[PDB]
């Protein structure tokens, strides 16, 4: 028992649906974990992009499978509204939508694109802030490049709570 030993139920949030895999985004913003529907628990046809669901990593039998990235097992539904939220009242910082992290990941993350945050002379991109399934209320929307948005940054240490937003 020190806390890098095993039995840690890791917690996660489905971000891509393919009808065979899927990939759960990390609750802590790590990476993408590939996560076979072979080894669910419970009904799959009901799952939809940011449902909440607790699993394990299989890192039983060999690290270096095929390409040390391992599969899931054991993936179950958790209640809706426990990911936590930004504590932040009114928001952090705006920004517009920068482009699609394409050619960033040679698996193609796309998914989870990148915002261009002004600095505080509001003149300029400082970095780059990722934004996920979670993080995307409004993730019905095209928001694509060009559009504006606001959110918080705070414990989620990225952009959480995007919100499409135009303004006047």
């Not at 505080?120 to 979670?134: D, P």
Request: charged fraction near 20%.
């Amino acid at each position: 028992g020190a806390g890098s030993d095993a039995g840690q139920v890791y917690r996660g949030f489905i971000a891509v649906m393919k009808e065979n895999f899927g990939f759960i985004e990390t609750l802590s913003h790590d990476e993408e974990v590939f996560f076979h529907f072979s080894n669910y628990m419970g009904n799959p046809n009901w799952l939809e992009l940011g449902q909440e669901v607790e699993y394990t990593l299989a890192r039983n039998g060999n690290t270096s499978v095929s390409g040390n990235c391992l599969p899931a097992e054991n993936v179950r539904m958790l209640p809706k509204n426990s990911i936590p939220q930004p504590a932040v009242l009114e928001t952090t910082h705006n920004g517009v939508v920068a482009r699609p992290l394409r050619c960033i990941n040679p698996d193609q993350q796309e998914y989870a694109g990148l915002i261009e945050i002004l600095d505080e002379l509001r003149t300029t991109v400082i970095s780059q802030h990722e934004f996920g399934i979670t993080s995307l209320v409004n993730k019905r929307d095209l928001l694509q490049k060009g559009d504006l948005v606001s959110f918080r940054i705070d414990e989620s240490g990225r952009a959480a709570c995007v919100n499409a937003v135009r303004q006047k």
